[PDB]
Write an enzyme that holds these catalytic residues in place. Structure first.
Site, short mmCIF file in Angstrom:
data_model
loop_
_atom_site.label_atom_id
_atom_site.label_comp_id
_atom_site.label_asym_id
_atom_site.label_seq_id
_atom_site.Cartn_x
_atom_site.Cartn_y
_atom_site.Cartn_z
N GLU A 237 -5.47 9.79 1.18
CA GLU A 237 -5.66 8.47 1.03
C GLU A 237 -6.98 8.16 0.16
O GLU A 237 -6.77 7.20 -0.89
CB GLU A 237 -6.36 8.04 2.63
CG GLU A 237 -6.04 6.79 3.08
CD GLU A 237 -4.53 6.27 3.42
OE1 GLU A 237 -3.62 7.41 3.45
OE2 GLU A 237 -4.05 5.15 3.02
N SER B 131 -4.41 1.56 -4.10
CA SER B 131 -4.03 0.29 -3.79
C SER B 131 -5.29 -0.99 -3.98
O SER B 131 -5.04 -1.87 -4.42
CB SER B 131 -4.02 0.37 -2.15
OG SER B 131 -2.79 1.38 -1.77
N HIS C 152 1.41 5.54 -1.82
CA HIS C 152 1.75 6.90 -1.47
C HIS C 152 3.01 7.46 -2.15
O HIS C 152 2.99 8.38 -2.63
CB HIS C 152 2.17 6.72 0.09
CG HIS C 152 0.99 6.67 0.91
ND1 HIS C 152 0.19 7.63 1.30
CD2 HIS C 152 0.34 5.65 1.60
CE1 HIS C 152 -0.71 7.45 1.98
NE2 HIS C 152 -0.72 6.39 2.24
N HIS D 48 0.85 -1.09 0.02
CA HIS D 48 -0.06 -0.11 -0.09
C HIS D 48 0.75 1.38 -0.09
O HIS D 48 0.61 2.25 -0.67
CB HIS D 48 -1.19 0.12 1.12
CG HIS D 48 -1.53 1.49 1.69
ND1 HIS D 48 -2.36 1.88 0.61
CD2 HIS D 48 -1.41 2.06 2.48
CE1 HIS D 48 -2.84 3.08 0.92
NE2 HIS D 48 -2.21 3.10 2.19
FE LIG Z 1 -2.12 5.03 3.37
#
Ligand SMILES: [Fe+3]
Length: 349
Positions: free
Chosen positions: A222, A241, A182, A177
């Site tokens: 996010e 993700s 990120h 992830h």
């Molecule tokens: Fe995160």
């Protein structure tokens, strides 16, 4: 004495980069503490790895390089499944910033399906490109401590891999992830500044305000969308993700709104997917503007100014520190004039 009393009324925050270690090790829940519904809750082999990554992360100290991690065959295979199924959506779902840095990550950081990238390679990559760095974390930090990291452009990352039983699903932020969600956006300067804005706004802030910034972090960093040339693209790490929520956020059966810091920070963060709404920013410059403005609403006796040369936090409490900043801006504006004059001298305009 006046400055001493000022900081005593506000929550502690790291004023030096070396003090950030206190935030990194304040783990509320270690990675080895698997949840009851976790697919590896009865997997002793998996628990052994989870405990291993905790010990590695706990051994990390400022100044020391991030140790190389020998991932097992099962962990690499799990990474490979995630790497492929997401690469089939990226050129049609990921933003321009993602598609610009992802091939670079494949070249310099070894983003392949048969190799799990190391954090030390990623950290040097991000530092050289956007000044961001990564740190291994042993588990969950408080929102205050995690955001404090962003103030120094430091992103705390996990190193463990999700359970191999179901690679297309994870209740927790594993290293798949972090690296695929990120990292490719952290390499973008405008995004890095935006992420650092949230961090700076949390320093010395109340728990209520910190929870608001955490919410803004949630529906942007996010789970955030960005409108690029009419087409809708996802830039949120949670979206990049999850292969299922990625296609959903860009579908027609999803409620799409605009990122409004005051209203978005009141929205409920749903861990059990999906989300009620997805917020859209025009760019990371506007997003930065949204957080640059929102920090004014947060109550604290002072304002903060990040010193990138010493990696420390300058507290703007007196007219002397403020005048010092303005003077530097007058010097920088002078350089701007010089560049303008040189352009006229050579380009004839
Ligand atoms: Fe995160």
């Amino acid at each position: 004495l006046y400055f001493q009393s000022m900081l005593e009324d506000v929550p502690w925050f790291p004023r030096k980069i070396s003090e950030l270690d206190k935030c990194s090790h304040r783990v509320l829940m270690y990675g080895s503490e698997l949840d009851a519904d976790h697919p590896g809750f009865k997997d002793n082999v998996y628990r052994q790895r989870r405990k291993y990554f905790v010990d590695v992360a706990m051994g990390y100290k400022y100044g020391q390089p991030i140790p190389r991690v020998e991932y097992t065959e099962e962990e690499t295979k799990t990474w490979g499944v995630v790497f492929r199924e997401l690469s089939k959506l990226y050129p049609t779902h990921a933003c321009r910033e993602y598609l610009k840095n992802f091939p670079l990550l494949t070249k310099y950081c070894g983003y392949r399906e048969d190799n799990v990238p190391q954090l030390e390679d990623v950290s040097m990559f991000l530092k050289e490109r956007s000044g961001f760095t990564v740190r291994p974390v042993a588990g969950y930090l408080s929102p205050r401590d995690f955001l404090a990291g962003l103030a120094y452009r430091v992103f705390h990352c996990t190193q463990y891999i999700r359970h191999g039983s179901d690679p297309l699903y994870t209740p927790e932020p594993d290293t798949c992830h972090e690296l695929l969600g990120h990292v490719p956006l952290l390499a973008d300067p405008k995004f890095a500044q935006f992420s650092q804005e949230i961090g700076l706004a949390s320093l010395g802030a109340s728990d209520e305000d910190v929870q608001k910034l955490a919410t803004c972090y949630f529906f942007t960093i996010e789970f955030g969308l960005c409108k690029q040339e009419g087409q809708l693209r996802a830039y949120g790490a949670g979206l990049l993700s999850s292969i299922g929520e990625l296609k959903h956020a860009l579908s027609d059966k999803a409620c799409v709104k605009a990122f409004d810091p005051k209203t978005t920070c009141l929205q409920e963060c749903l861990i059990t997917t999906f989300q009620e709404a997805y917020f859209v920013s025009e760019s990371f410059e506007e997003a930065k503007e949204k957080m640059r403005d929102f920090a004014k609403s947060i109550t604290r006796p002072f304002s903060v100014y990040f010193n990138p040369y010493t990696q420390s936090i300058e507290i703007l409490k007196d007219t002397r520190s403020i005048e010092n900043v303005v003077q530097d801006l007058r010097s920088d504006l002078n350089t701007v004039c010089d560049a303008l004059n040189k352009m006229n001298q050579y380009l004839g305009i």
